[PDB]
Amino acid sequence: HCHANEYAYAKWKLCSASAICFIFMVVTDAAHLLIDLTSFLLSLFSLWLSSKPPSKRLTFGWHRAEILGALLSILCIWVVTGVLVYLACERLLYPDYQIQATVMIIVSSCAVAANIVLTVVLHQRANASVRAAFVHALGDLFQSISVLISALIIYFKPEYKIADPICTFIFSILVLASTITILKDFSILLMEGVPKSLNYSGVKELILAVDGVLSVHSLHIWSLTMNQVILSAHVATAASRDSQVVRREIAKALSKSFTMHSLTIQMESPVDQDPDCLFCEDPCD
Amino acid sequence: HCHEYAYAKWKLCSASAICFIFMIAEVVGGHIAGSLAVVTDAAHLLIDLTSFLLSLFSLWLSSKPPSKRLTFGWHRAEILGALLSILCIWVVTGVLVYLACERLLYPDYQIQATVMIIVSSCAVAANIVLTANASVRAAFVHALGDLFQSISVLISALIIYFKPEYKIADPICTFIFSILVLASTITILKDFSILLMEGVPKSLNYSGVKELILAVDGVLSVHSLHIWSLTMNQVILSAHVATAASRDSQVVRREIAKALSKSFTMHSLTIQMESPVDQDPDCLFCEDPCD
Ligand SMILES: [Zn+2]
Ligand SMILES: [Zn+2]
Ligand SMILES: [Zn+2]
Ligand SMILES: [Zn+2]
């Protein structure tokens, strides 16, 4: 008949961390004291949207909205990065600037400790929702050390005085290198692309492992947000065989292969027309 | 059975290049000259430029057929680029309102708008020379719409040449134009978001299509009804259905899909055509959409 364990593990992840970065929240230096707080509050928002039920307009529910908000946060990250870059290139163009070289250090003192508390505690031992907040936390950890160490030279030998530019540069660059991966991941998720953890051809062999299947076309198997996969394909079997028990055994095999979320099978007839099935011939791969 | 590219590129890539140099002119008149009002349409021209860009981009993608990792072609990358361009519009409007409210609170500036007027005067004249299916009309309506916006920027600045008394025509006009453009963004982004989360198309109705299902001799009971569209107008269908053992299930779904095609166009569709086991009270995982 084809028919709150791990998501609930996330309630104790940010609801506290939100208040923590809130307490965390020089006047211009306190600017990024909220870029993390807002992001993680929106992450919790995404969690509550994952809690939502299905509907008619949204038959599957309100799930991918989580990735939507995630990528929105990532775009705001893209934003704040370029902001810092503008500051750095301008202050390169304006190499003159005066401020005590430790007043920012002494407040980055708690910051490096502030960030690392929430960052690596949020480290894994696998919803990307958590990971998106983590790489942000891991991201602003760079902001914690972008000026802390890079200003000590000014405090010690200001004959260079511009180590903050290069350190900000490299840290923002590494944040972006962190982004690119999950960026392309989220893309192919929303791009209706099959999940990374799966091998289309592998699933094909899983199918063909049954005596019943003689051919399969119009196969489509993509996933929801994280581990919720949807399956569709056509199949022709021996006309002598009972599709019902056949398809039941098929679904049995697909389940015993690995997890599923939703499966549809056309169960076509052997009849069928290969020479012009080219419309769904095969994925070019 | 379960079922020009050059000119397509050229007449649209070249047209986008015409819009590009349009932007180029209105922006070389833009920054150093005045820096106050003219930049308003700049984005609008630029955002429509990017719209044409991403449409031809999507054609370029469609030139690549689907693959193993991509079962449905590079279509939805259209929406990706669309929403990204939307966010660019949002950030440019944001910096615009930022500087505008700053100049409002900080009146410390001065402008000889006249020399900045004529560089923006022929700009709307350039909007005049650039003038079917109710879409080209909608584009002509868009064109007419662009005028109302573009023509408004001058008439504001003109009396100021005679009336230095107020001088505040630029902030308010920039503000209202930002409102119009952000409202357009709101509309289109609501549309595209509802499209995402694998939403059903607005042009169609779940209840209507499921009634079309239930209105056939074969059907006895359906469930798992999951239907939606890809990017713009290509819809996909998935659902289960049980009926009597006597029915020739194959021809049943055959005629079902036939009547569905008859109802309207689809891109893909699958049906499981389930059995009269029917664990109805335990089908709560597939009982109905909450609506
Ligand atoms: Zn079922
Ligand atoms: Zn075929
Ligand atoms: Zn087929
Ligand atoms: Zn059920």
From Swiss-Prot, chain B:
Binding of Zn(2+) 2, residues: 2, 223, 240, 274
Record topology, Lumenal, vesicle segments: 39-41, 100-113, 161-167
Species of origin: Homo sapiens
Side of membrane Cytoplasmic, spans: 63-78, 189-291
TM helices/strands, residue ranges: 18-38, 42-62, 79-99, 114-131, 140-160, 168-188
Membrane topology: Multi-pass membrane protein
Additional free-text comment from the UniProt record: Each subunit of the homodimer independently transports zinc ions in a pH-dependent manner. The cytosolic pH promotes binding of zinc ions to the transporter binding site. Upon change into the organelle-facing conformation, the two histidines of the zinc-binding site get protonated at lumenal lower pH, triggering zinc release into the organelle. The transporter then moves back to the cytosolic-facing conformation where the two histidines get deprotonated at higher pH, resulting in a net antiport of 2 protons.
Record-listed Zn(2+) 1 binding positions: 44, 48, 142, 146
Effect seen on changing residue 48 to N: Loss of transported zinc binding and decreased zinc ion transmembrane transport
Annotated GO CC locations: cytoplasmic vesicle; Golgi membrane; intracellular membrane-bounded organelle; plasma membrane; secretory granule; secretory granule membrane; transport vesicle membrane
Stated consequence of mutating residue 142 to A: Decreased zinc ion transmembrane transport
Protein name as annotated: Proton-coupled zinc antiporter SLC30A8
UniProt binding sites for Zn(2+) 4: 75, 267
Coiled-coil portions: none
Catalyzed reactions per annotation: Zn(2+)(in) + 2 H(+)(out) = Zn(2+)(out) + 2 H(+)(in)
Tissue specificity as recorded in UniProt: In the endocrine pancreas, expressed in insulin-producing beta cells. Expressed at relatively high levels in subcutaneous fat tissue from lean persons; much lower levels in visceral fat, whether from lean or obese individuals, and in subcutaneous fat tissue from obese individuals. Expressed in peripheral blood mononuclear cells, including T-cells and B-cells, with great variation among individuals ranging from negative to strongly positive.
A single MF term (Gene Ontology): zinc ion transmembrane transporter activity
